[PDB]
């Protein structure tokens, strides 16, 4: 995020970190949508121009986090991926159309003050909230600057 | 550089043709853009590393947070007349349902 604030504790309890096993480090954001389902951008998993091509065994999801770098003991839960899915019509070649992937966790995550799922929109909530000029909120541990 | 703790920014959704007109990349219906217009003068954007995170909105009818978009793409971070792009979560709900049943 460029030009944002520090989140407050508990502010975004569905915020997930995709974390690389191989050289241990942040891949991407993601979001917790049930006790076993995490949602992310397909391009975090598969993006050929960039050699980005990750499987289950390359990835940990880290849920409950505030700090980017530390292992938040007693607060975070680290899960392992059972099954990754990428939209079949995901256009990585052109314009990243349908940039979405579902990640299924091995064991359920237990909810807490710091870990809790976001809702997914119904047609009607989309219908009334998805309009020009209505504000939305984005959250992440990505670069503060371009470079 | 990187921040030491999770960052947050509120951003307004932008009209479809302003989105289309800010870029050469072909925009689809499974995308929306968001950001401040260059005039507006408030800055803010997603950037490298933020990909896959939630774009969320709080429902004023039931006080519940909804995820409307997935942080997807942008041409550089926080440039004027440019906008962040998000995966339209609801347009892709049938697929999400499909994958969850099994």
């Amino acid at each position: 995020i460029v030009e944002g604030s520090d989140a407050e504790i508990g502010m975004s309890p569905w915020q997930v970190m995709l974390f690389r096993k191989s050289p241990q480090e942040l891949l991407c954001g993601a979001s917790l949508i049930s006790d076993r389902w995490v949602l992310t951008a397909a391009h975090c998993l598969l993006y050929p121009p960039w050699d980005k091509n990750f499987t289950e065994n390359d990835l940990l999801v880290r849920i409950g986090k505030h700090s980017r770098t530390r292992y938040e003991r007693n607060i975070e839960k680290i899960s392992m991926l059972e099954k990754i899915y990428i939209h079949p019509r995901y256009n990585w070649r052109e314009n990243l159309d349908r940039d979405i992937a579902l990640m299924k966790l091995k064991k359920p995550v237990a909810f807490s003050d710091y870990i809790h799922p976001v809702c997914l929109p119904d047609r009607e909530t989309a219908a009334s909230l998805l309009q020009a000029g209505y504000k939305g909120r984005v959250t992440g541990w990505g670069n503060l600057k371009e470079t | 550089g990187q921040p030491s703790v999770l960052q947050v920014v509120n951003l307004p959704i932008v009209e479809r043709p302003v989105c289309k007109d800010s870029t050469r990349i072909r925009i689809t219906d499974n995308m929306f853009c968001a950001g401040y217009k260059p005039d507006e003068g408030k800055r803010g954007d997603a950037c490298e590393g933020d990909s896959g995170g939630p774009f969320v909105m709080k429902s004023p009818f039931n006080n519940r947070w909804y995820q409307m978009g997935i942080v997807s793409w942008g041409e550089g971070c926080d440039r004027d007349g440019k906008y962040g792009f998000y995966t339209h979560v609801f347009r892709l709900k049938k697929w999400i349902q499909k994958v969850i049943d099994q």
């Binding site: 604030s5 407050e8 504790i9 508990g10 502010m11 309890p13 949508i33 909810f111 807490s112 003050d113 710091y114 809790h116 799922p117 976001v118 809702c119 997914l120 909230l129 000029g133 209505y134 504000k135 939305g136 909120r137 | 947050v8 509120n10 307004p12 909105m57 709080k58 429902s59 004023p60 039931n62 006080n63 519940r64 947070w65 909804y66």
Partner: peptide, 27 residues
């Protein structure tokens, strides 16, 4: 589903520092 209700905010009837910016925008 308890989706969308945050243990430290909505369930304690607290607001974060900026959620109100969001609600305003629905002008």
């Amino acid at each position: 589903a308890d989706c969308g209700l945050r243990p430290l905010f909505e369930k304690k009837s607290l607001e974060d520092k900026t959620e109100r910016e969001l609600l305003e925008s629905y002008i």
